[PDB]
Structures are given as structure tokens and as C-alpha cells.
From a paper:
Rab27A and Rab27B are secretory Rabs with well-characterised roles in transport and docking of secretory vesicles (exosomes) at the plasma membrane. Rab27A promotes the growth and invasion of multiple cancer types such as breast, lung and pancreatic, by enhancing secretion of chemokines, metalloproteases and exosomes. Reported co-crystal structures show that several effectors of Rab27A interact with the Rab27A SF4 pocket (‘WF-binding pocket’) via a conserved tryptophan–phenylalanine (WF) dipeptide motif. To obtain structural insight into the ligandability of this pocket, a novel construct was designed fusing Rab27A to part of an effector protein (fRab27A), allowing crystallisation of Rab27A in high throughput.
Structure-guided inhibitor development can be a powerful tool in targeting GTPases;21 however, in line with previous reports we were unable to crystallise monomeric Rab27A without substantial mutation to the PPI interface. We therefore designed a novel Rab27A construct to allow crystallisation whilst leaving the WF-binding pocket free for ligand binding. The C-terminus of Slp2a SHD1 (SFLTEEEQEAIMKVLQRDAALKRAEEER (residues 5–32)) was linked to the N-terminus of Rab27A via a flexible poly glycine-serine linker. The unstructured C-terminal hypervariable region of Rab27A was truncated and a Q78L mutation was introduced in the nucleotide binding pocket to promote adoption of the active GTP-bound conformation. We termed this class of constructs fusion-Rab27A (fRab27A); variants bearing C123S and C188S mutations (fRab27A), as well as single mutants specified by the presence of the wild-type cysteine at position 123 (fRab27A-C123) or 188 (fRab27A-C188), could be purified to homogeneity and form protein crystals which diffract to high resolution (C123S, C188S, 2.32 Å, Table S1†). fRab27A adopted a closely similar conformation to the Rab27A-Slp2a co-crystal structure, with average root-mean-square deviation (RMSD) of 0.554 Å. Importantly, the structure leaves the WF-binding pocket unoccupied, as designed. Covalent ligands are increasingly used to target challenging proteins. fRab27A contains two cysteine residues (C123 and C188) in close proximity to the WF-binding pocket, which are mutated to serine in crystal structures. The novel fusion construct presented here provides a new tool for structure-guided drug discovery efforts against Rab27A.
Numbering used by the authors:
A (entry chain A): -37 to -7, 5 to 59, 65 to 188
B (entry chain C): -37 to -9, 4 to 56, 62 to 188
Amino acid sequence: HMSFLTEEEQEAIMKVLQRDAALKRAEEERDDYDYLIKFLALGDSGVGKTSVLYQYTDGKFNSKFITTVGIDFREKRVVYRASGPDGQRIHLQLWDTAGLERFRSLTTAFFRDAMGFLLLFDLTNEQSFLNVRNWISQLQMHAYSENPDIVLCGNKSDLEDQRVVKEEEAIALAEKYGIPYFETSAANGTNISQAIEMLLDLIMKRMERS
Amino acid sequence: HMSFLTEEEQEAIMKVLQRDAALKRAEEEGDYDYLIKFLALGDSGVGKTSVLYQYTDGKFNSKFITTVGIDFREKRVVYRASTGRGQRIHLQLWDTAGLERFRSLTTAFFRDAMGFLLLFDLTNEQSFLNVRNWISQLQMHAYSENPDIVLCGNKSDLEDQRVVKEEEAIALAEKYGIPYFETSAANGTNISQAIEMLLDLIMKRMERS
Ligand SMILES: Nc1nc2c(ncn2[C@@H]2O[C@H](COP(=O)(O)OP(=O)(O)NP(=O)(O)O)[C@@H](O)[C@H]2O)c(=O)[nH]1
Ligand SMILES: Nc1nc2c(ncn2[C@@H]2O[C@H](COP(=O)(O)OP(=O)(O)NP(=O)(O)O)[C@@H](O)[C@H]2O)c(=O)[nH]1
Ligand SMILES: [Mg+2]
Ligand SMILES: [Mg+2]
């Protein structure tokens, strides 16, 4: 399989890298917040990574499929409270990777910048669920820490008539790898905040203990 | 200069990334004091892979094997401040492809670099004229405002084919305030010096933090 990038696509990717470098250089000055926290969404093409992040940052949802050109990221400013009987201002950088195999090496090159991973499959696509095992072993091999923080999302929960992944099977996978699991919908917002706030909690607690 | 990627090339790149992650995970788990990373860049053919290989192994291959996107080498060295006490340094030497079809992938590794070894080929005028473009790329894409850069005019052993005048290269390096070495990966001339100068810049910038 040969893949290609047009000039326009190379241009778009370089712009993402340019925005990223500008963001990191501005943290080197005022590191208007307390932490820059970075995580990365991954999983098969079409499962809803881009929609999930857009629902989270803007509360909006597009029906039209615009497959991601390699890599992108979004930003959000949130307040984090140490979960338990406890406010830190968090600048979130949300990396959005393409799922298509043609972008595997480019997207894996950004794992080094990720403190945690939002891993998606599509509740209506059984193969995307069967590939979760491969995504996890790719994360074991390519993450830059031992035992990376991962939150698993079974997305498109609003499409009940098309659901093919049984809750029991997804639960069994989450227990086997010891990772949290949420069933989400980027269309209506269900559990989006909850899944991403849990990932942020995992990251913040791991830093405090280090 | 159409941008394409094959499956076998992705596999090779993914192996480098796998090696990289293993190295980073092993530093977090010693035998040295710092993991110091820098990155070689410049036009295809100027000798980036050759320079790093001469430095780490004292060897040189005549045959051109263009780099498949990205690679890195390693070396364990002792660094002395300016003297000072010997610090054990684990070097990770990133090697980027110069061809445009790898530009996005290679630029994605600037973030891991504490310093840059920028090469042109003393026998290739185009590679010298592209130096200012590479410096501009580093300003736009490095993850600090004034990245440390050492400029190498490589292939100094090819005297009859030399076309870049030393005065012009010295003046270009002085304009940007970067050190300049004329190197040969074939016979080793100035390789150690240029890379030790880059390491010095990085270690001294850290000490001031
Ligand atoms: N009904 C419904 N549709 C969704 C949901 N999430 C995504 N979609 C739809 O599914 C399609 C794929 O979504 P998209 O976010 O682009 O997926 P992706 O994971 O980013 N794909 P890629 O990796 O190729 O960039 C789009 O048509 C989008 O509208 C969801 O929760 N519910
Ligand atoms: N005579 C001589 N040949 C050199 C020198 N440095 C590199 N070469 C030769 O020039 C060719 C290109 O060298 P190479 O290190 O592969 O260049 P590169 O910068 O890594 N190219 P790429 O970006 O495509 O990977 C090879 O044939 C190599 O042997 C040098 O100092 N002297
Ligand atoms: Mg997408
Ligand atoms: Mg090379």
C-alpha cells in the first residue's frame, strides 16, 4: 500500500505542527494557568474521535464525515479539583489522530507528547471493537511510560438500533486491561465530559504521586 | 518531489519509534547523569547519516542509502564543563531525512531535540542556499525561542568539488550567531569538535536554569 499527501495536506499538517510549537513556546513563558495537560485520542477511522473532542470543547456536532488529515488538536481551559474531599486551572491540549493505517507512523510520532489516551471504538462497528486489543498493544509498545493512562469509550451510544457491541463484552475487555470504560455519544454529549474528566483525573493523580 | 509513503517504510519508521519509546521508558526507570538529545537536519545528500555514523562508530560508507524518514543513534560520552567534573552523558542522536516527502514526519521530531546539527554540503551550492530556510523552519517549529544550532559545511575532503566559499559560510553563521565547522564524515575531520560544541551549548544552557 502506497499512501500520498498532496501539497494541501502537507500544508495543513505543517500548520498543526506550527500551532503546536507556538503553544509550547507560550507555556515556556507563563507555564494564565497551572498546568498544560495533554492527551491523545486514537482508534479506528470513523469511530468518532474528532466528533467526541469537538462535542467536548464546543458542544457541537457535525453529521458530515470529514476524515482527519493525519493529526490535529483542540484546546480547552478547565478547572480541576483534586477528586475526593478536596481548584487548579488546566490548559488542555487534546490531540486528535487519524485512524487510517496510512497515518500510523505520523500519528504514533505524537504519542511522546501525550500524558494519557482516549481510546475509542464504535458501538455500531464490531470490528472497531475487536481492534481495541491491537490499539492497546500498540500503546504498550509506543507509549513513553510503562502502563499509560487510558480511558476506553464505546461511542455512538445514541444509535441503539445499530448497536452490535454487547455491554458485557466491552465490560469484560475493560476489566481485563484494568481501564475505565464509558459508553459515549458525540451527537448528544452523553458521558463525553465524564470520560475526559476521568482521564484528566488519572493524569493529575499520577503527577501528584510523582 | 511528490509526497508518498509505502507500507514497508511505515514499518521501518514504527520500529524506530518503538526503539525510541523503549529508550525513554528505560531512562525513567544510574549509569549516566543526563539523556541529551539533538537532531541532524539539512538537504538530502549532505551527509547527516554519514556524520553521525562517523561520530559514533568511526566508520564511513561510500554508498548513498537515503534515510527512510527518521532514525537515531546513541553514544555514551563524558562531558567536562568548559575545568569541571566529568558528567556521564547518554546521547540520542536523531537523524532526519532531508527529502520533502518526509518533511511532516521529521518536523514532528523537532520537539524531542535539545539542539540541532544543521548540515550543508560544501560541494552543493543549493544545500548552502537552503540553510536560511532550514534555520527559519527551526525558528518556527523548535519548541524554544532560540534553539541551539551548530552549522556544519560537510564533505570538506572533496576539495576539487568545493563550491561554497568559506567566507560566505562564516558570514552566514555569524549573521545568525551560530558556530560553524567544516567537516568530513569520510575522514572524521571536525566531527567530534562540531558535536562537542553542540553538546557544550546544551549543557551550558541547562546549567543556567
Ligand atoms: N450518531 C452519531 N454519529 C457519530 C458519533 N460520533 C461520530 N459520529 C459520526 O460518525 C462519522 C465519523 O466521525 P469522526 O468524528 O469524523 O470519526 P473519526 O474517528 O475522527 N474518523 P478519522 O480517524 O478518520 O478522523 C461522522 O459522520 C460523525 O458525524 C456519535 O456519537 N453518534
Ligand atoms: N566524500 C564524502 N562523501 C560524503 C561525506 N558525507 C557523506 N558523504 C557521501 O554522500 C552521500 C550522502 O550521504 P548521507 O549521509 O547518506 O546523506 P544524508 O544527509 O543522510 N541524506 P538523506 O537526507 O537523504 O538521508 C553518500 O554517498 C555518502 O557516502 C563526506 O564528508 N565526504
Ligand atoms: Mg477525525
Ligand atoms: Mg540520511
